[PDB]
Amino acid sequence: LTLEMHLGDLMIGELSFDATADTFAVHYTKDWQQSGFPLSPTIPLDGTGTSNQISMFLVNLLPENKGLDYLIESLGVSKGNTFALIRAIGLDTAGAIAFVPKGALLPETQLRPIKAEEVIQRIEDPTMWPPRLSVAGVQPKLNLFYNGKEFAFAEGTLSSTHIVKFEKYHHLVINEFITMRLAKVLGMNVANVDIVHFGRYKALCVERFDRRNIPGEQRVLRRHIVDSCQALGFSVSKKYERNFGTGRDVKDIREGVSFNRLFSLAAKCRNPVAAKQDMLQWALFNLLTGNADAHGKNYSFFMTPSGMEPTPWYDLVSVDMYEDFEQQLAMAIDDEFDPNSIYAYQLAAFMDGLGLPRNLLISNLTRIARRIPQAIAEVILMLPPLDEDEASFVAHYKTQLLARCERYLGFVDEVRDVEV
Amino acid sequence: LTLEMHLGDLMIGELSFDATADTFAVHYTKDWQQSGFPLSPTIPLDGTGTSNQISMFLVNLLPENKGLDYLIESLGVSKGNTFALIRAIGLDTAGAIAFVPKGALLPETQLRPIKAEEVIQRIEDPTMWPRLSVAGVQPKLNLFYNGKEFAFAEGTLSSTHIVKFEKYHHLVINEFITMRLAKVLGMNVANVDIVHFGRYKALCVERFDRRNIPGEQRVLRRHIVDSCQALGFSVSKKYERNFGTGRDVKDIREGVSFNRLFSLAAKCRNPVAAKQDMLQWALFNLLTGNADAHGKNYSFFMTPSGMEPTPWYDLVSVDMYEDFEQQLAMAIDDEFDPNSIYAYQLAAFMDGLGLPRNLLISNLTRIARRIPQAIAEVILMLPPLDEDEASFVAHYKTQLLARCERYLGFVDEVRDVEV
Amino acid sequence: IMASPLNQQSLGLLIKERRKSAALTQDVAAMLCGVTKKTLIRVEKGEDVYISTVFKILDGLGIDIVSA
Amino acid sequence: IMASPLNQQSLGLLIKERRKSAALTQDVAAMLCGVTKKTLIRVEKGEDVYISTVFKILDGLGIDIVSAQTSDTETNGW
DNA sequence: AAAAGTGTAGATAAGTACACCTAAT
DNA sequence: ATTAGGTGTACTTATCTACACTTT
C-alpha cells in the first residue's frame, strides 16, 4: 500500500495507496520538502497533492499501446489497477524518480547484451514476436542502453539511455530523422538522434536527455521530467486539445491542452520569456514541417526547485507526408484545427489570443521559412545510403517542405494589418 | 606584547603591541571577520589597520585632563606609554570592547557601595583628593547606578552612569536644562537627572554604551566611537582648528568640520536619518549657545551593518559664561564667530554640505519656535532652587530667547541669498 | 515582517517603512534624497516613477537590493 | 559575473547577461516583455527608465530582487 | 547575404519640479 | 498645528512605431 519514492540512489519521499477508498496519497520527507522539488507542480511538497491529481500523474507515465496490454497480461492484472502497473515499471519511468517497494531491490546490477538477430525476429513478425482504419500514432519502439558500440538492456539502477524506434509504416525513420535533425541544424533545442541498422531494417536511435550515462563505471544519473499534461494537471486523455474526438458532436469540445494553456506554463518556468520563445518556435516549427500530431505528452519540462524549464524537442515528425491519416492540428490556432486553413487571420488572432505581439511571430516565422531551403540540403547529406523509393520519398519530402515555407511566406506580411 | 580584545565576557580578537618597532597591530578571529564589526572604520577586520590609526584610536579613549596625569602618576609610567594605560583601564572603556591582558581577572566581581559622607569630603578640597581661556576643567566620576545607591563596579561589571559635579557656577543646571530641552524638543539625547550630595548638586547622566541588566551581576555594553576615531583623526583634531585660536594659526583647519562630520552619513545605516540628526545637532547648538561642540561630543554605535548616530550628550550653553572664549568649534562657512552668523553663513553652509536651504529653514524655524514653550517646561523639571540660581535661569532664559529671535529674524533671507 | 519578493508597490511600501522606522516626515525625507515631497509620495504609493528617482531614495536611506 | 549590491548600471548589465544566458536576442526580449527594442537597450545601459518598465522585464525574465534582513542590528544592540 | 546591436524622428504621453497652492486628522 | 495628502503650470523626459545603419 506504500511505495517509496527514490531519486537516483536517494529516497525523497513516500507514495501511499489506500486500497479501500481507491485513493492515492503522496507525502515527502522533511529534508526534501524544504530543499527539493515536487513530482509535478500539482503534487506539492507539503503532501497536499490531491489524490486524483496524483493518480493522473502516474497514469501519464504508462504506455497507451499494445505494450500496455502485454504488460497487464504479463502481470495478469486488471486495467483499473494502476498501483500494480506502476510497481512493475517503478524502477524505470519518465524522469529521475523510481518507485520502489520497501526493502526490495535486485540490484544486481550488471547487463544483458543483444544480438541483431533477436531484434530482427521482433521486427519481421510483430504477431509471433511483438486493421487500424483511420488514426494518428503510434510507432513500435523499445528502450535500451547505449555505450556507443554494442546495445544491451540495462537492469536495476542501470537504465536505458536511448530510445530505439522501429519502422512499421513507410519511411517513418527517414521522416523523423530529417525533421529532428532539421530542427537541430536550425539551432533549435532538440534531442540528439541517430540512425541504426538491423539486418535490412533501419531504426531511429534517440538520445534520452532525462538520463545521462556516466562513462567508466556502472551508474546512470537521471534528471526528472514531466509532460505538459502532468504539469497542467491534465489527464492522459486530455493530451489532445479535443479530449474526446474529431466527431462533429464532439467537434466543439476542447477541454484538452491548447497553445494558450501551454503558454500559461511560462510563468512557472525559470525563465518565462525564454520558455515562451521555445514554445512559439515549437508551434511554428511544427506548422512549417507539417507536424499535426504534436500534443501534450510530446512537450515536457525539467523539474527543478527553482522552477520548470522547457526540454529539448523530441518526436518531431511530418505527418503531412502521410495522407492515409486525417490530419488536424492537435493544438488549434485561433479555434482552427485544419493545417490548410491557416492564414494571416488565424495567426493574428492566435498571437492576440496569447496576448503576445504579432511582430514576434512574423520574425520567427519569416526567419525559419527562409533558412529551411538551405538547411534541408545540409540534413540530406547526413543520411546513409538510400534506395530509390527513399530518395523519391525524401525528394517528395523536400519539395512540399519548401511549398509550406513558400506558402506561409506569401501572406505573412499581411498579418500586421489584419483587424480582428 | 599581546592583549586580547574582549566583547563583554567574549573574546573577539587580539591587540598586539611590538615594543621594539613602537608599533600596534590588531588582528581578529575568523568568526568575527565574517559576522562582526571592526573597532573603528579605520581598524578593519582583515588586520590591515595601520599602526598609527590603531595608536590614535587607543589614545582617543583616554582622558585629556588631570585624570590623565593621575593615571600615569599612579602607575608611574611615561606620557608616551599608551599600552600600560589601556591595559589598566581595559576592563571599562567607552564602547563594548574590554582590553584584557592574557589570563588575568579578579573578577570577582561584586560591588563597592558608596556613602554620602565620603563624597562631601571629596567635594570641598580638590588638592586633598587627587590662565587665559576655555576648554575644561570640570569634575566628573563614572559610577554604578541601581536607582538608589551609587557604587564602584568591579570586574566584568562597569559603571552605567556618569555623575558630573559643578565647581564652576551652575554647570549642572546649565547642562541639565539644555540636555532636558533637547529631550523635551523630541531630540534623541541621553537621559540625565540631577542628584544631591549635601549642599552640593551633581548631574547624573545615563550611559548609552552601557545597559544594566536587572536581577543579577552583569553590565551589558554597546560599542561606540566618537567622530574622531571614525574619521581616523588624532585626539588633537577634536576641534576644527587643531592647534589654537592664534591669528597666525587661525587659518589652519585640519580638524573635524561640519563637512567632515556629515561625510560620515554615507557609512551610517541610514544616511538620511543621520544628516538630519547632524544638522539638528548643529542647529540646536546654535540656538542653545553651545560653542564647545566638538569631535568627541558626537559619537556613533558600531554594528556589522554600519554606523548609527548615538543620542546627543554633553550639551551645554557656554554663552552663559563670559569668562570664557566662545567660538564655534566647527565653523559655519568659514565663520567661527557665533555673533557673526547671518543668512549668508547659513546659506553657503548648507550649500557647502550640498543640502537644500529650505531644509535648514524648516528645521531651524520649527525648533526655534517650539523652544519658547519648551524652555518653560524644562524649568519645571528642575529641583528646588535658591535665589542666585533662579537668577541664573532667568539670564539663561532671556538670552536663549534672544538667540531664537535673532536667528528667527533673518532666517527668511537665507533662501534668496546669492553667494 | 511580511518579508517580500520585491514589486513596485511593496518597494514603495518598503521605503515608507524605512522612512517611518527612522522617524522622518515625507518633506525632510524628500529633500535629503533630492526629490520633491509629491514625488516621494508617488514612490511610496508605488505609482510609476523614473528608476533614477527610486535609486536616489534607495541610496539615501541605505537600503540595498540583490538578485536572488 | 559579480555584482554584490545592484545599482542602475549593473542592473541593466544583469538583464543583458540573463538575456544572453538564454541565448535570446534584444528584439524578442523586448517584445515578449511588452516593450520596444530601443527601451530594452536603454534598460541594459542603465539609462533612466520608468520603474514599471524595469519591472516588465524583471517579472518577464523571472529574476527576483530582494532587500537585506536582519532584523537590523541582527536582533542585537545592548 | 544576412543578423544583432544600435541608431533616428515625430506623435504620444508621462513624471518632476517649484513656489506655493491648498484638505486631511 | 504639523502631517499626509492634492495640486497647477511649466520643465524635462520616456515609450511608441518605423526606417536606417554600424557591426559580423
PDB file of N, CA, C and O (backbone and C1' of nucleotides) in Angstrom, chain D residues 12-13 15-16 19 26-27 30 35-47 49 57, chain E residues 4-8, chain F residues 15:
ATOM      1  N   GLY D  12      21.078  46.882 -15.363  1.00  0.00           N
ATOM      2  CA  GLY D  12      20.972  46.815 -16.804  1.00  0.00           C
ATOM      3  C   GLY D  12      21.866  45.725 -17.351  1.00  0.00           C
ATOM      4  O   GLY D  12      21.472  44.976 -18.243  1.00  0.00           O
ATOM      5  N   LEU D  13      23.069  45.626 -16.796  1.00  0.00           N
ATOM      6  CA  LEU D  13      24.015  44.607 -17.226  1.00  0.00           C
ATOM      7  C   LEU D  13      23.541  43.225 -16.789  1.00  0.00           C
ATOM      8  O   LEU D  13      23.841  42.220 -17.439  1.00  0.00           O
ATOM      9  N   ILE D  15      20.339  42.286 -16.618  1.00  0.00           N
ATOM     10  CA  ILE D  15      19.304  41.954 -17.590  1.00  0.00           C
ATOM     11  C   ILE D  15      19.908  41.482 -18.908  1.00  0.00           C
ATOM     12  O   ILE D  15      19.452  40.496 -19.486  1.00  0.00           O
ATOM     13  N   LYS D  16      20.931  42.190 -19.381  1.00  0.00           N
ATOM     14  CA  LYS D  16      21.587  41.838 -20.635  1.00  0.00           C
ATOM     15  C   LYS D  16      22.237  40.459 -20.589  1.00  0.00           C
ATOM     16  O   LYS D  16      22.234  39.738 -21.588  1.00  0.00           O
ATOM     17  N   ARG D  19      19.627  37.595 -20.506  1.00  0.00           N
ATOM     18  CA  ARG D  19      19.087  37.584 -21.858  1.00  0.00           C
ATOM     19  C   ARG D  19      20.019  36.811 -22.774  1.00  0.00           C
ATOM     20  O   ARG D  19      19.580  36.035 -23.619  1.00  0.00           O
ATOM     21  N   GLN D  26      17.857  40.832 -28.489  1.00  0.00           N
ATOM     22  CA  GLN D  26      17.248  42.015 -27.882  1.00  0.00           C
ATOM     23  C   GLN D  26      15.852  42.305 -28.428  1.00  0.00           C
ATOM     24  O   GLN D  26      15.023  42.901 -27.740  1.00  0.00           O
ATOM     25  N   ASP D  27      15.601  41.909 -29.670  1.00  0.00           N
ATOM     26  CA  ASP D  27      14.322  42.196 -30.311  1.00  0.00           C
ATOM     27  C   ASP D  27      13.197  41.347 -29.718  1.00  0.00           C
ATOM     28  O   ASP D  27      12.102  41.850 -29.466  1.00  0.00           O
ATOM     29  N   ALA D  30      12.441  42.218 -25.937  1.00  0.00           N
ATOM     30  CA  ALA D  30      11.654  43.440 -25.813  1.00  0.00           C
ATOM     31  C   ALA D  30      10.172  43.160 -26.063  1.00  0.00           C
ATOM     32  O   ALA D  30       9.308  43.616 -25.313  1.00  0.00           O
ATOM     33  N   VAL D  35       7.741  45.672 -24.462  1.00  0.00           N
ATOM     34  CA  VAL D  35       8.428  46.949 -24.627  1.00  0.00           C
ATOM     35  C   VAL D  35       9.121  47.011 -25.989  1.00  0.00           C
ATOM     36  O   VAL D  35       9.239  46.003 -26.685  1.00  0.00           O
ATOM     37  N   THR D  36       9.549  48.208 -26.375  1.00  0.00           N
ATOM     38  CA  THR D  36      10.297  48.408 -27.612  1.00  0.00           C
ATOM     39  C   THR D  36      11.754  47.968 -27.447  1.00  0.00           C
ATOM     40  O   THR D  36      12.264  47.889 -26.330  1.00  0.00           O
ATOM     41  N   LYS D  37      12.407  47.648 -28.560  1.00  0.00           N
ATOM     42  CA  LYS D  37      13.821  47.277 -28.553  1.00  0.00           C
ATOM     43  C   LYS D  37      14.670  48.423 -28.006  1.00  0.00           C
ATOM     44  O   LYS D  37      15.591  48.205 -27.218  1.00  0.00           O
ATOM     45  N   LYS D  38      14.349  49.641 -28.435  1.00  0.00           N
ATOM     46  CA  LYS D  38      15.075  50.833 -28.010  1.00  0.00           C
ATOM     47  C   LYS D  38      15.087  50.977 -26.492  1.00  0.00           C
ATOM     48  O   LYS D  38      16.111  51.317 -25.899  1.00  0.00           O
ATOM     49  N   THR D  39      13.945  50.713 -25.868  1.00  0.00           N
ATOM     50  CA  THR D  39      13.825  50.827 -24.420  1.00  0.00           C
ATOM     51  C   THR D  39      14.660  49.774 -23.712  1.00  0.00           C
ATOM     52  O   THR D  39      15.304  50.066 -22.710  1.00  0.00           O
ATOM     53  N   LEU D  40      14.657  48.553 -24.229  1.00  0.00           N
ATOM     54  CA  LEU D  40      15.446  47.493 -23.624  1.00  0.00           C
ATOM     55  C   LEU D  40      16.930  47.827 -23.724  1.00  0.00           C
ATOM     56  O   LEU D  40      17.710  47.483 -22.836  1.00  0.00           O
ATOM     57  N   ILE D  41      17.321  48.485 -24.812  1.00  0.00           N
ATOM     58  CA  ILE D  41      18.691  48.963 -24.949  1.00  0.00           C
ATOM     59  C   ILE D  41      18.975  49.958 -23.828  1.00  0.00           C
ATOM     60  O   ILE D  41      19.999  49.871 -23.154  1.00  0.00           O
ATOM     61  N   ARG D  42      18.043  50.884 -23.617  1.00  0.00           N
ATOM     62  CA  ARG D  42      18.168  51.880 -22.558  1.00  0.00           C
ATOM     63  C   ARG D  42      18.243  51.231 -21.183  1.00  0.00           C
ATOM     64  O   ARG D  42      19.016  51.658 -20.329  1.00  0.00           O
ATOM     65  N   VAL D  43      17.429  50.203 -20.971  1.00  0.00           N
ATOM     66  CA  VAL D  43      17.421  49.475 -19.708  1.00  0.00           C
ATOM     67  C   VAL D  43      18.769  48.821 -19.441  1.00  0.00           C
ATOM     68  O   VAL D  43      19.314  48.924 -18.343  1.00  0.00           O
ATOM     69  N   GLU D  44      19.297  48.140 -20.449  1.00  0.00           N
ATOM     70  CA  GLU D  44      20.538  47.404 -20.294  1.00  0.00           C
ATOM     71  C   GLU D  44      21.731  48.329 -20.037  1.00  0.00           C
ATOM     72  O   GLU D  44      22.662  47.964 -19.315  1.00  0.00           O
ATOM     73  N   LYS D  45      21.695  49.526 -20.621  1.00  0.00           N
ATOM     74  CA  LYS D  45      22.780  50.500 -20.467  1.00  0.00           C
ATOM     75  C   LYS D  45      22.645  51.297 -19.172  1.00  0.00           C
ATOM     76  O   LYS D  45      23.526  52.081 -18.820  1.00  0.00           O
ATOM     77  N   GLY D  46      21.544  51.078 -18.462  1.00  0.00           N
ATOM     78  CA  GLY D  46      21.306  51.726 -17.185  1.00  0.00           C
ATOM     79  C   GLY D  46      20.814  53.156 -17.292  1.00  0.00           C
ATOM     80  O   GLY D  46      20.690  53.846 -16.284  1.00  0.00           O
ATOM     81  N   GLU D  47      20.510  53.605 -18.504  1.00  0.00           N
ATOM     82  CA  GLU D  47      19.943  54.935 -18.671  1.00  0.00           C
ATOM     83  C   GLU D  47      18.572  54.944 -18.009  1.00  0.00           C
ATOM     84  O   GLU D  47      17.901  53.915 -17.966  1.00  0.00           O
ATOM     85  N   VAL D  49      14.900  54.908 -16.869  1.00  0.00           N
ATOM     86  CA  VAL D  49      13.668  54.395 -17.458  1.00  0.00           C
ATOM     87  C   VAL D  49      12.575  54.376 -16.389  1.00  0.00           C
ATOM     88  O   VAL D  49      12.862  54.590 -15.211  1.00  0.00           O
ATOM     89  N   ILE D  57      10.330  43.805 -17.566  1.00  0.00           N
ATOM     90  CA  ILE D  57      11.400  42.919 -17.965  1.00  0.00           C
ATOM     91  C   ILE D  57      11.744  41.977 -16.819  1.00  0.00           C
ATOM     92  O   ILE D  57      12.038  40.800 -17.029  1.00  0.00           O
TER      93      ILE D  57
ATOM     94  P    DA E   4      19.840  37.515 -35.230  1.00  0.00           P
ATOM     95  O5'  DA E   4      20.359  38.387 -33.992  1.00  0.00           O
ATOM     96  C5'  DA E   4      21.610  38.087 -33.386  1.00  0.00           C
ATOM     97  C4'  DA E   4      22.377  39.354 -33.060  1.00  0.00           C
ATOM     98  C3'  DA E   4      21.685  40.264 -32.050  1.00  0.00           C
ATOM     99  O3'  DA E   4      22.477  40.323 -30.855  1.00  0.00           O
ATOM    100  C1'  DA E   4      22.468  41.506 -33.976  1.00  0.00           C
ATOM    101  P    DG E   5      21.896  41.001 -29.517  1.00  0.00           P
ATOM    102  O5'  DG E   5      22.431  42.514 -29.585  1.00  0.00           O
ATOM    103  C5'  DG E   5      23.830  42.803 -29.703  1.00  0.00           C
ATOM    104  C4'  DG E   5      24.093  44.154 -30.359  1.00  0.00           C
ATOM    105  C3'  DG E   5      23.520  45.366 -29.623  1.00  0.00           C
ATOM    106  O3'  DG E   5      24.570  46.152 -29.053  1.00  0.00           O
ATOM    107  C1'  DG E   5      23.246  45.551 -31.998  1.00  0.00           C
ATOM    108  P    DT E   6      24.228  47.314 -27.995  1.00  0.00           P
ATOM    109  O5'  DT E   6      23.768  48.540 -28.905  1.00  0.00           O
ATOM    110  C5'  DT E   6      24.675  49.041 -29.861  1.00  0.00           C
ATOM    111  C4'  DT E   6      23.998  49.996 -30.825  1.00  0.00           C
ATOM    112  C3'  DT E   6      23.008  50.983 -30.226  1.00  0.00           C
ATOM    113  O3'  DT E   6      23.658  52.069 -29.568  1.00  0.00           O
ATOM    114  C1'  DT E   6      22.491  50.306 -32.487  1.00  0.00           C
ATOM    115  P    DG E   7      22.842  53.413 -29.230  1.00  0.00           P
ATOM    116  O5'  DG E   7      22.933  54.258 -30.584  1.00  0.00           O
ATOM    117  C5'  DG E   7      21.888  55.129 -30.990  1.00  0.00           C
ATOM    118  C4'  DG E   7      21.885  55.255 -32.501  1.00  0.00           C
ATOM    119  C3'  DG E   7      20.949  56.324 -33.042  1.00  0.00           C
ATOM    120  O3'  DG E   7      21.691  57.518 -33.269  1.00  0.00           O
ATOM    121  C1'  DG E   7      20.624  54.222 -34.207  1.00  0.00           C
ATOM    122  P    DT E   8      21.202  58.914 -32.643  1.00  0.00           P
ATOM    123  O5'  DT E   8      19.977  59.350 -33.582  1.00  0.00           O
ATOM    124  C5'  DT E   8      20.188  59.596 -34.976  1.00  0.00           C
ATOM    125  C4'  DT E   8      18.897  59.480 -35.774  1.00  0.00           C
ATOM    126  C3'  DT E   8      17.849  60.550 -35.468  1.00  0.00           C
ATOM    127  O3'  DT E   8      17.645  61.385 -36.609  1.00  0.00           O
ATOM    128  C1'  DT E   8      16.866  58.344 -35.534  1.00  0.00           C
TER     129       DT E   8
ATOM    130  P    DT F  15      11.202  54.157 -20.896  1.00  0.00           P
ATOM    131  O5'  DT F  15      10.037  53.779 -21.917  1.00  0.00           O
ATOM    132  C5'  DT F  15       8.697  53.765 -21.469  1.00  0.00           C
ATOM    133  C4'  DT F  15       7.761  53.812 -22.652  1.00  0.00           C
ATOM    134  C3'  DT F  15       8.095  52.822 -23.772  1.00  0.00           C
ATOM    135  O3'  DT F  15       7.041  51.860 -23.919  1.00  0.00           O
ATOM    136  C1'  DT F  15       7.540  54.992 -24.587  1.00  0.00           C
TER     137       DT F  15
END
